[PDB]
Amino acid sequence: DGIYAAFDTLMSTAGVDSQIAALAASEADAGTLDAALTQSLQEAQGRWGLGLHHLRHEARLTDDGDIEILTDGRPSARVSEGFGALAQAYAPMQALDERGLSQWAALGEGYRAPGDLPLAQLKVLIEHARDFETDWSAGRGETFQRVWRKGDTLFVEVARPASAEAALSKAAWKVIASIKDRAFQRELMRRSEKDGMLGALLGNLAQLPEAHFTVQAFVQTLSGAAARNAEEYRAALKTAAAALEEYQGVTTRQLSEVLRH
Amino acid sequence: DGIYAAFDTLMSTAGVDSQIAALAASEADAGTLDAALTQSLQEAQGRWGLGLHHLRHEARLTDDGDIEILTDGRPSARVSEGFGALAQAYAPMQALDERGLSQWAALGEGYRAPGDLPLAQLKVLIEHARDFETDWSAGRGETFQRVWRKGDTLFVEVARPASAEAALSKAAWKVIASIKDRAFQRELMRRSEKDGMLGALLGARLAQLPEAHFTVQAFVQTLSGAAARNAEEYRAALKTAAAALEEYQGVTTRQLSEVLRHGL
Q: Tell me if A84 sits within 8 A of A51, measured CB to CB.
A: no
Mutation site, B178, B191, B195, interface A, largest A CB count within 10 A: B178
Residue B99 and residue B65: Cα distance in Å, rounded? Answer: 39
Q: Which of A157, A153, A125, A137 is nearest to A241 (CA)?
A: A157
Amino acid at position B165, single letter: E
- B185 vs A contacts (CB less than 8 Å): 177-178
Given CB atoms, is B129 within the 8 Å cutoff of chain A? no
Given CB atoms, is B205 within the 8 Å cutoff of chain A? no
Q: Tell me if B128 sits within 8 A of B151, measured CB to CB.
A: no
Evaluate the CA torsion angle B230, B232, B236, B241 in order and state its sign.
positive
Amino acid at position A16, single letter: V
Residue B182 and residue B193: Cα distance in Å, rounded? Answer: 16
Q: Which of A139, A119, A172, A157 is nearest to A244 (CA)?
A: A157
What is the structure's resolution, reported in angstroms to one decimal? 2.8
Q: B222-228: long-range contacts at Cβ-Cβ below 8 A with a sequence spacing of 24 or more?
A: B222/B153, B222/B154, B222/B155, B222/B156, B223/B153, B223/B154, B223/B156, B224/B152, B224/B153, B224/B154, B225/B152, B227/B154, B228/B149, B228/B152, B228/B153, B228/B154
β pairing state of A144-150 and A153-159: antiparallel
What DSSP designation does B145 have?
E
Helix (H, G, I), strand (E, B) or coil at B78: strand
Q: Where are the alpha helices (DSSP H) in chain B?
A: 3-12, 20-25, 32-48, 82-90, 119-128, 164-178, 182-195, 197-202, 231-260
- B189 vs A contacts (CB less than 8 Å): 173-174, 177
Residue B172 and residue B199: Cα distance in Å, rounded? Answer: 9
Whether A176 sits inside 8 A of B174 (CB atoms) is no
Q: Which of B160, B102, B126 is nearest to B235 (CA)?
A: B126
Residue B77 and residue B57: Cα distance in Å, rounded? Answer: 12
What DSSP designation does B131 have?
S
Q: Which DSSP string corresponds to chain A?
A: -HHHHHHHHHHHTTT----HHHHHHTT--HHHHHHHHHHHHHHHHHHHT---TTS-EEEEE-TTS-EEEEETTEEEEEGGG-HHHHHHHHGGG--B-TTS-B-S-TT-SS--B-TT--HHHHHHHHHH-SSEEB--EE-TTS-EEEEEEETTEEEEEEE----HHHHHHHHHHHHHHH-S-HHHHHHHHHHHHHHHHHHHHH--TTTSGGGT----EEEEEEEGGGGG-HHHHHHHHHHHHHHHHHHHHHHHHHHHHHHH-
CA dihedral A116, A119, A120, A124 (to 10 degrees): 90
β pairing state of A132-133 and A74-78: unpaired
Q: Which of B166, B145, B169 is nearest to B155 (CA)?
A: B145
Given CB atoms, is A163 within the 8 Å cutoff of chain B? no
Q: Which residues contact B169 (CB under 8 A, 6 or more apart)?
A: B197, B198
Q: Tell me if A106 sits within 8 A of A95, measured CB to CB.
A: no
Q: Which of B44, B8, B41, B13 is nearest to B23 (CA)?
A: B8
Question: What is the distance in angstroms between the Cα of B154 and the nearest Cα belonging to chain A?
Answer: 31
**Overall residue count recorded for chain A in this entry:** 261
Nearest C-alpha in A relative to B141: A194
- B179 vs A contacts (CB less than 8 Å): 177
Question: What is the distance in angstroms between the Cα of A217 and the nearest Cα belonging to chain B?
Answer: 18
Evaluate the CA torsion angle B81, B82, B87, B90 in order and state its sign.
positive
Question: What is the distance in angstroms between the Cα of A164 and the nearest Cα belonging to chain B?
Answer: 17
